[PDB]
Design a protein around this motif. Sequence first.
Motif, PDB file in Angstrom:
ATOM      1  N   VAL A 128     -71.284  36.598  57.000  1.00 42.22           N
ATOM      2  CA  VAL A 128     -70.057  35.009  56.821  1.00 42.22           C
ATOM      3  C   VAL A 128     -68.617  36.475  57.095  1.00 42.22           C
ATOM      4  CG1 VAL A 128     -69.720  33.530  55.594  1.00 42.22           C
ATOM      5  CG2 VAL A 128     -71.702  33.694  55.789  1.00 42.22           C
ATOM      6  N   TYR A 163     -64.479  34.346  57.528  1.00 35.44           N
ATOM      7  CA  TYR A 163     -63.873  33.893  56.628  1.00 35.44           C
ATOM      8  C   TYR A 163     -62.534  34.087  56.778  1.00 35.44           C
ATOM      9  CZ  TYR A 163     -63.937  34.977  52.335  1.00 35.44           C
ATOM     10  OH  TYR A 163     -64.296  35.678  50.934  1.00 35.44           O
ATOM     11  N   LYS A 188     -60.858  28.821  56.061  1.00 37.80           N
ATOM     12  CA  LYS A 188     -61.715  28.649  57.237  1.00 37.80           C
ATOM     13  C   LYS A 188     -62.898  29.659  57.436  1.00 37.80           C
ATOM     14  CE  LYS A 188     -59.679  28.735  61.379  1.00 37.80           C
ATOM     15  NZ  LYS A 188     -58.427  28.889  62.001  1.00 37.80           N
ATOM     16  N   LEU A 189     -64.320  29.129  58.107  1.00 33.46           N
ATOM     17  CA  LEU A 189     -64.823  30.107  58.715  1.00 33.46           C
ATOM     18  C   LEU A 189     -64.445  30.401  60.371  1.00 33.46           C
ATOM     19  CD1 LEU A 189     -68.579  27.996  57.633  1.00 33.46           C
ATOM     20  CD2 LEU A 189     -67.594  30.036  57.290  1.00 33.46           C
ATOM     21  N   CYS A 190     -64.867  31.978  59.885  1.00 31.33           N
ATOM     22  CA  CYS A 190     -64.058  32.906  61.705  1.00 31.33           C
ATOM     23  C   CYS A 190     -65.388  31.608  63.305  1.00 31.33           C
ATOM     24  CB  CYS A 190     -64.647  33.621  61.796  1.00 31.33           C
ATOM     25  SG  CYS A 190     -63.500  34.819  60.735  1.00 31.33           S
ATOM     26  N   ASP A 191     -66.242  32.104  63.245  1.00 28.55           N
ATOM     27  CA  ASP A 191     -67.053  31.430  64.159  1.00 28.55           C
ATOM     28  C   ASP A 191     -67.261  30.164  64.706  1.00 28.55           C
ATOM     29  OD1 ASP A 191     -68.943  31.322  62.005  1.00 28.55           O
ATOM     30  OD2 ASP A 191     -70.744  32.421  62.886  1.00 28.55           O
ATOM     31  N   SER A 192     -67.034  28.888  63.185  1.00 28.85           N
ATOM     32  CA  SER A 192     -67.353  27.502  63.758  1.00 28.85           C
ATOM     33  C   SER A 192     -65.783  27.043  63.206  1.00 28.85           C
ATOM     34  CB  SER A 192     -68.062  27.201  62.528  1.00 28.85           C
ATOM     35  OG  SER A 192     -68.275  27.199  61.413  1.00 28.85           O
ATOM     36  N   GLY A 193     -64.878  27.481  62.486  1.00 28.62           N
ATOM     37  CA  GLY A 193     -63.603  26.588  62.654  1.00 28.62           C
ATOM     38  C   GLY A 193     -63.322  26.126  61.519  1.00 28.62           C
ATOM     39  N   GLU A 194     -65.235  25.529  60.639  1.00 28.36           N
ATOM     40  CA  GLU A 194     -65.584  24.386  59.714  1.00 28.36           C
ATOM     41  C   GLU A 194     -64.123  25.376  58.642  1.00 28.36           C
ATOM     42  OE1 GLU A 194     -69.002  25.258  60.268  1.00 28.36           O
ATOM     43  OE2 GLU A 194     -70.159  23.114  59.430  1.00 28.36           O
ATOM     44  N   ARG A 239     -73.629  25.938  51.431  1.00 30.09           N
ATOM     45  CA  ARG A 239     -73.603  27.113  52.151  1.00 30.09           C
ATOM     46  C   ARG A 239     -74.382  27.718  52.074  1.00 30.09           C
ATOM     47  NH1 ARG A 239     -70.255  24.765  56.717  1.00 30.09           N
ATOM     48  NH2 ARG A 239     -70.401  22.731  56.864  1.00 30.09           N
ATOM     49  N   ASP A 257     -69.496  23.203  50.504  1.00 29.12           N
ATOM     50  CA  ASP A 257     -68.389  22.110  51.940  1.00 29.12           C
ATOM     51  C   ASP A 257     -67.126  21.825  51.160  1.00 29.12           C
ATOM     52  OD1 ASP A 257     -71.056  21.220  53.639  1.00 29.12           O
ATOM     53  OD2 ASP A 257     -71.227  19.741  52.405  1.00 29.12           O
TER      54      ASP A 257
END
Lengths: 350, 350
Positions: B20, B22, B40-46, B79, B99
């Motif tokens: 993971v 971030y 912010k999560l790198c692979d999703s931007g979430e 998560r 979340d």
Amino acid sequence: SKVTTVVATPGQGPDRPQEVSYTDTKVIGNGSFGVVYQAKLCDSGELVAIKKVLQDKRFKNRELQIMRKLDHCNIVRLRYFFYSSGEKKDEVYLNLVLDYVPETVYRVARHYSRAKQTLPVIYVKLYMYQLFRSLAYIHSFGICHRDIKPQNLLLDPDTAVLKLCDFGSAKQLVRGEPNVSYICSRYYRAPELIFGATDYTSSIDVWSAGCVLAELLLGQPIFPGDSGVDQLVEIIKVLGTPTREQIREMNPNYTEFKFPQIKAHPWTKVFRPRTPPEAIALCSRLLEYTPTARLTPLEACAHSFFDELRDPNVKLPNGRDTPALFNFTTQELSSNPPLATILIPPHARI
Amino acid sequence: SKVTTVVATPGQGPDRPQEVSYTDTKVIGNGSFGVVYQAKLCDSGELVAIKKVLQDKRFKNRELQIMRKLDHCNIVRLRYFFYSSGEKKDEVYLNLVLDYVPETVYRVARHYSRAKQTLPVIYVKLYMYQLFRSLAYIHSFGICHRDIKPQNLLLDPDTAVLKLCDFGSAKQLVRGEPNVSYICSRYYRAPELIFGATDYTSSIDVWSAGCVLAELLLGQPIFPGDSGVDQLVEIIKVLGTPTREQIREMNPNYTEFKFPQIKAHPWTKVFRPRTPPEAIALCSRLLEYTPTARLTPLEACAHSFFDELRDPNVKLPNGRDTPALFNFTTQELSSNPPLATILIPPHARI
Ligand SMILES: CN1CCN(S(=O)(=O)c2ccc(-c3cnc(N)c(C(=O)Nc4cccnc4)n3)cc2)CC1
Ligand SMILES: CN1CCN(S(=O)(=O)c2ccc(-c3cnc(N)c(C(=O)Nc4cccnc4)n3)cc2)CC1
């Protein structure tokens, strides 16, 4: 102005009612208890506080009975008391005519905090010593205040006189008799109270007074938190994790429940670097897990932190003399009469 | 921007660790527990929240074990989780990747009271219903949150989605097993907690939930006070004096200790005149002295106050659709399966 004339009974002494006339009735406080007013004695021009609570038809007022027994320079005096009409019709109201002291340690400490300052240490000494004298006095009658907090510590800014107030939570604690654990305001509650002990002693007031000392030194509450849990974490962070026996002393039924294992934090690391070692030493001896290991109010008065007050040449920063500090009675010295050797300095004897 | 790559275990499902990554780490909160970051999560931007607490390996983290079981739309999802450092070459931190929900009921309600406004009742309905769903869910596993307060209720201002957070005080309550009474934040504590009961149930969350409802309706806390005493006076003012059986139900050992005689105040006289009768009716059924007399979370979802949410034409004030409201599971419905006849309206998801 609108002059109110009442026939009031004097707080102490002979039950010989007197006509008391007062004007300029302004409100100074509201709360669960009722209302506190400020008024001017028509006669003397003197300011008084009138605490108006509701008369419970079932039994005599506990606060009134306590007030009547007390006469100390560091406790707000019950001057008169009387019964009146109030807000609710067909309802009886008890009115306690008390000494008016203009400021509170809460407002004073808050000015300093907002201005990014600490209260000068001389004031911390004067205010704390006076608090411990008031506690030594009430404790000698078996009475526990049960709500020691900066809001309940009144100050005269000119004389540097501190006066304890609010006897609404005060109770005579008798060994073997159980007591409610929901007394005492958040930040100032002894760990035994947090653990729900009903067998606690007057040492709860000593814990509370230690929380006032540490707050006056830090500029913010030492043990904050909006839950008992958060408060306990702050205590554990400073005092280290309580031992099996330390927990047993507070509340026995709570010996199994586990806490995080944090090492005994040095009190020298708690306060700013220019804090007197004696201020820190006092805190560590007031803020003990074991209620029986805490200093008594009278033993705290005799602590090295208050030595400056015992200096013959001690003066207030405004040039004035320090207030009464050594007029101890046999009643206030009763817990440990030999302490007077330290308490009353050679100059006070002459 | 610093990219942090960790090997983290997914919250639910198979214990199959993954990498993971971030960025944009930013502290969003501090407390007794530790620190909460936003990243912010790198692979999703979430956007996610990372709750970092010190973990002693002489036990498993209670919050983590609870989080890993949970999967509800009104509860912040775990998560990932992972171990790292922060302070010391022995000190190990548990990191909970959750979340991120941008606002809080606390901050929202505070805008309205500063603006001398109340939160429009549609939001009170949406927020409260979602809170009760989250409580119905956790309660079905025997888990009690134990810290229901406006700060632990997160909101997405656009979707009107509420998510419960902070499982740091959460516990599975087993009948006959005793529990600490020092949990739960001031204003929101059930009377049984104030009386020091250790035999309390999940109904403490329902009391707390009712305190949130009344606050959203009033614009200020319903039962304030800095001590248990002051809080109890505020409760007695609204609910009347508790009967000896009502006291017995909360904590039995406190049946002897006397309280002032206040008549049962009408709940209609508590709130402003334009308050819906169903809002007041809900309060009176949540805020009961007897823990067994309080509505259950699932019974509160089915109350007439939430009927507007069950209307097929209800829409948010911003023109958007209301969020998920009827996706109940058998787990969520277990306390009373026949309630689904009211809970899931005819138009609901086909
Ligand atoms: C007029 N101003 C009102 C604002 N303050 S204050 O809040 O700092 C303040 C409040 C109360 C007192 C005061 C004075 N004399 C008293 N004797 C009492 C008193 O007995 N208070 C009390 C409070 C609660 C329960 N029982 C008793 N209070 C003094 C200053 C400054 C003066
Ligand atoms: C930059 N701002 C910081 C100020 N706020 S806030 O105080 O309204 C706020 C604080 C926390 C969260 C948040 C989001 N997601 C989460 N998942 C958590 C969370 O888990 N919090 C938490 C708190 C205490 C104990 N355990 C967990 N918090 C959201 C808004 C708004 C944004």
